[PDB]
């Protein structure tokens, strides 16, 4: 009866091992769809097709390019360079630890006002913070733009230097409230240019000329002069040239990664639907895929490959094959010929971008594939619904196993009594 | 057969899209006629090259119920639908335009 119950187990244990391999297959399927979804979403960015690269003739001017630039040639002439105001105290001090302000007042405040910032910056010095090092540390810890330094002009004499940021909107109007000696030491007014601190450097704006247009920025990093190219100025160049040329490398690599991900998904599905033909046909072969004949893989394949013909896209191309990617006859795998894809990316970049990326909401091959894979990979999707149905059947089977195990106990007792 | 016929679907979609507009020129359309011969060979491969139970059932149609496995009273009614050019109307597919 142990052998009889093992024969009873034969399809029961076969189904239990099949359910274990089916849970493994579901895990592998979810992992493959996760990787495919990651690659597909990586492709879903339209900014890859609008990409360029810029070069400059002069080593002084530095050029970089963001997304959305336009190809061409620009003649840059830099006339001025931005500078940052620096204020230095007049009275040199013996040591950096000697007290600067009056020790009678335990609380004082440094108030710095600029045209740039709207709320004036207040830095609070409590008792014992009237040393030069303490003022330096307070102003550097505020981290609001002003940068205090110390200069040793010669042995036993020091100065305090406060430097703002670049531009004419960052001129300082310093004040000290709560103290008198410190107010006598640190007090400037850039509106009337009169104060108790000398001005070592004068604030200036950065002026330049791009293709006959006069640009005036605050800092030496110009951003929106052609709206897509960032320029870093170092010296006063004259008639420098910047060349911006279209690029397709990022889009090409995204396409390669996407086709590789789809090929890996198809390979995993094909291996999961594996079968071996046996001539006698007495029983099913050992090398059988657990998810063979199930609606899961077939439905996923049909749904994914149906999106390659998308009616949402309004571009000139209606079939993805026109980009230069063809699906092989033997198996559902995609392969790319370099010439056609390169020509399409070079000439019809807009058409390819509209075909793949689409408007991002209800248009494009990639958007439809993304939403379909999201719906399938979700728990409410048909794939996880079938998985839950299988799990419920397995739970009912487990109850059946417990009942039949009670039957095993009864039958074992019966034959023990007989034998 | 489904892989071959979906490849054919993508082919014919490209064919109609390129023939409707001026993107595909008439020398390109002669190359498309070469592709039409190639996809006819594709149909011939899905029909003849593949085989069922040692026989080219995808090349010859036998719409008959299979013999009973003796495990059940009822017989399995398999209506074997071969992927043929003629009976399914696929042979009539030819999108070559007028010269």
């Amino acid at each position: 009866l142990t052998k009889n119950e093992k024969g009873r187990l034969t399809p029961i244990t076969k189904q239990q091992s099949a359910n274990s391999a089916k849970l493994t297959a579901y895990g592998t399927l979810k992992s493959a769809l996760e990787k495919f979804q990651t690659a597909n979403t990586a492709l879903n960015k339209a900014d890859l097709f609008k990409s360029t690269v810029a070069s400059s003739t002069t080593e002084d001017l530095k050029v970089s390019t963001t997304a959305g630039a336009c190809a061409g040639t620009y003649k840059i002439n830099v006339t001025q360079l931005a500078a940052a105001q620096s204020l230095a105290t007049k009275t040199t001090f013996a040591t950096t630890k000697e007290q600067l302000g009056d020790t009678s007042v335990t609380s004082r405040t440094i108030k710095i006002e600029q045209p740039g910032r709207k709320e004036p910056l207040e830095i609070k010095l409590d008792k014992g913070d009237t040393s030069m090092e303490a003022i330096r540390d307070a102003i550097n810890d505020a981290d609001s733009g002003i940068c205090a330094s110390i200069v040793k002009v010669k042995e036993n004499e020091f100065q305090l230097v406060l430097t703002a940021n670049s531009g004419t909107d960052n001129t300082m109007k310093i004040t000290v409230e709560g103290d008198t000696k410190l107010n006598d030491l640190l007090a400037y007014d850039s509106t009337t240019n009169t104060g108790n601190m000398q001005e070592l450097v004068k604030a200036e704006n950065a002026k330049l000329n791009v293709n006959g247009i006069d640009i005036e920025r605050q800092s030496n990093t110009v951003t929106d002069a052609p709206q897509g190219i960032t320029l870093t100025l170092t010296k006063k160049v004259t008639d420098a040239t910047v060349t911006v040329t279209k690029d397709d490398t990022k889009a090409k690599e995204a396409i390669k990664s996407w086709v590789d991900a789809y090929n890996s998904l198809v390979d995993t599905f094909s291996s999961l639907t594996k079968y071996t033909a046996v001539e006698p046909g007495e029983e099913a072969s050992d090398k059988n895929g657990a998810l063979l004949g199930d609606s899961v893989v077939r439905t996923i394949q049909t749904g994914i490959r149906a999106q390659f013909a998308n009616s949402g896209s309004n571009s000139a191309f209606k079939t993805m094959a026109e980009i230069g990617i063809t699906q092989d006859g033997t198996s559902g795998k995609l392969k790319i010929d370099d010439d056609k894809l390169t020509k399409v990316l070079k000439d019809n970049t807009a058409a390819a971008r509209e075909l793949l990326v689409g408007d991002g909401k209800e248009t494009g091959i990639t958007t439809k594939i993304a939403t379909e894979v999201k719906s399938y990979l979700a728990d409410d999707g048909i794939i996880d619904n079938a998985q839950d149905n299988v799990n419920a059947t397995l739970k009912s089977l487990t109850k059946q196993y417990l009942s039949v195990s009670n039957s095993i106990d009864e039958t074992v007792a019966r034959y023990k009594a007989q034998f | 057969a489904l892989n071959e016929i979906n490849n054919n679907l993508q082919r014919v979609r490209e064919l109609a899209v390129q023939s409707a507009n001026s993107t595909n020129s008439q020398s390109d359309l002669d190359s498309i006629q070469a592709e039409i011969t190639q996809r006819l060979n594709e149909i011939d491969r899905v029909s003849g090259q593949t085989q069922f139970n040692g026989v080219k059932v995808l090349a010859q149609d036998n719409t008959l119920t299979i013999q009973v496995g003796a495990n059940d009273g009822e017989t399995i009614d398999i209506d074997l639908k071969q992927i043929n050019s003629q009976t399914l109307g696929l042979d009539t597919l030819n999108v070559q335009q007028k010269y």
Binding site: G7, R8, P11, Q15, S295 | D72, I76, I78
Partner: peptide
Amino acid sequence: AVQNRFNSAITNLGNTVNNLTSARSRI
């Protein structure tokens, strides 16, 4: 047709093996 009929037929093969197990209990 083929796939769903033969999935139900794999279930029916399990049922037939269950009947054979019942016969083994009978034998």
